[PDB]
Amino acid sequence: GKPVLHYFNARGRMECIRWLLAAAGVEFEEKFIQSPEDLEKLKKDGNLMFDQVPMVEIDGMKLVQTRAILNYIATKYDLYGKDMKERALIDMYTEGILDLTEMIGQLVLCPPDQREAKTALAKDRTKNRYLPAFEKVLKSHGQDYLVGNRLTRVDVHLLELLLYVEELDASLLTPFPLLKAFKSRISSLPNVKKFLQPGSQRKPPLDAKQIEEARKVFKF
Amino acid sequence: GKPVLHYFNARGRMECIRWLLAAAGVEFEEKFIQSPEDLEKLKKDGNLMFDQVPMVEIDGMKLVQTRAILNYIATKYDLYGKDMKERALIDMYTEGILDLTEMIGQLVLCPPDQREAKTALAKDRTKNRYLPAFEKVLKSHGQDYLVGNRLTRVDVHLLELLLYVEELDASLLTPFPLLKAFKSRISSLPNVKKFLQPGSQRKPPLDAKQIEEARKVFKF
Ligand SMILES: N[C@@H](CCC(=O)N[C@@H](CS[C@H]1c2c(cc3ccc4cccc5ccc2c3c45)C(=O)C(=O)[C@@H]1O)C(=O)NCC(=O)O)C(=O)O
Ligand SMILES: N[C@@H](CCC(=O)N[C@@H](CS[C@H]1c2c(cc3ccc4cccc5ccc2c3c45)C(=O)C(=O)[C@@H]1O)C(=O)NCC(=O)O)C(=O)O
């Protein structure tokens, strides 16, 4: 009974879910939306509560909304900490990471005349707001993981973000030693290493031609 | 030990938290950000993990990120369902609600040559996507509450959204009978009725002048 992930063949909002399942060591299948018809069929068949994907078929549910899916999976595979206090830290950290991830992913979609400004802003937020915040969390307790001295969903989310930060501008990570060491450690975990290796279901960034052609194949 | 809510004197992202606390019957205090200096002092004194509000002081923590705060309060006051399956539904419904709430609140902040288009879109999403989805949930089980036949955080989030929908265009709710009956019932709950009464900490929509004022008073 493998979860089925319904999304376009791209990172988008589904990648964080792919990462979480991979880290949990859970095998999943994907049903790619390749044409407006595919998407229309999902809607008509009553499979999308709000007519949007990501949508994940898991445990008899056709679950939509990225956060709801992530929350369910983290709880199911014990990657959501042990109590509500720990969950408050995990949630607070996760939301910050999701905010930056969105800001960065949004760049390739910015009108040409606005993209240089949006990019400088994203880089500024990365080095002056977000990375310092997490470097600080690690420094605060000197432990290997962000929360509870054990692996949780947020360690996975942070690793993922660091990869995107490295893609944006690798020099952004230079001033953060604790984060650099964290990146190396999480990357070495068996399930993670497996997802980072070539041939996995991990998705690449989309280039200009691809983004442009997909915006036209659908309605973006 | 009343929780302390730090935000501007307006709805913003803090209103959903005010509503959740009020529905739980939990008294809270508010410390309004009235000047850039107020905000700067919060940041400098180490109160905001990502230099942003909402921020809520509760149980020895200074919690930021709207969803992290809501999740903690829901769990603390037993408004988060009874298990992970129920939480998946609560989470999926809540995310759809936050999505529409954002879309609607964002309108007063859209340029004079967009509000027009943005507003038609929002109204369309409301009547053709979101209201139908929830009308359908209620129809599916004929129960008084959205999930588990008992009050949860999402019944509160839905009531709040319905109020905003009614402010946008009262005719939007007309084609949805189950939602109209739901709105009346929830509004009759003692804690809810109390917050709906004049003089409560419930905040009003901000007008054009007020928006422009703050827009210049701060970096908005
Ligand atoms: N709050 C929800 C949000 C879910 C959501 O937004 N889903 C969208 C995905 S399209 C998503 C989107 C946009 C532009 C593009 C542009 C190029 C592109 C190339 C390859 C893959 C995608 C994938 C998504 C996507 C886009 C691409 C832009 O329009 C937006 O940013 C959209 O959010 C969708 O299903 N749209 C169908 C429709 O409404 O009928 C969640 O967290 O799950
Ligand atoms: N993901 C986080 C997001 C939290 C967040 O965004 N906080 C902002 C609130 S300002 C918020 C915002 C904007 C415009 C306006 C414009 C008019 C206005 C009038 C009266 C009250 C507010 C309150 C908020 C606000 C704005 C107003 C627009 O810029 C944006 O929409 C902003 O998100 C903040 O603290 N900014 C300080 C700064 O970065 O240093 C969460 O969910 O908690």
UniProtKB/Swiss-Prot annotation, chains A, B:
InterPro entries registered for this protein in UniProt: Glutathione-S-Trfase_C-like, Glutathione-S-Trfase_C_sf, Glutathione_S-Trfase, Glutathione_S-Trfase_N, GST_alpha, GST_C, GST_superfamily, Thioredoxin-like_sf
Domain GST N-terminal: from-to ranges: 1-81
GO molecular function term, any single one: glutathione transferase activity
Ranges for domain GST C-terminal: 83-206
Domain of life of the source: Eukaryota
Catalytic activity from the UniProt record: RX + glutathione = an S-substituted glutathione + a halide anion + H(+)
Record's GO cellular component terms: cytosol; mitochondrion
Secretion signal, residue range per the UniProt entry: none
Tissue specificity annotation: Expressed in the kidney.
Stated name of the protein: Glutathione S-transferase A2
Organism per entry: Mus musculus
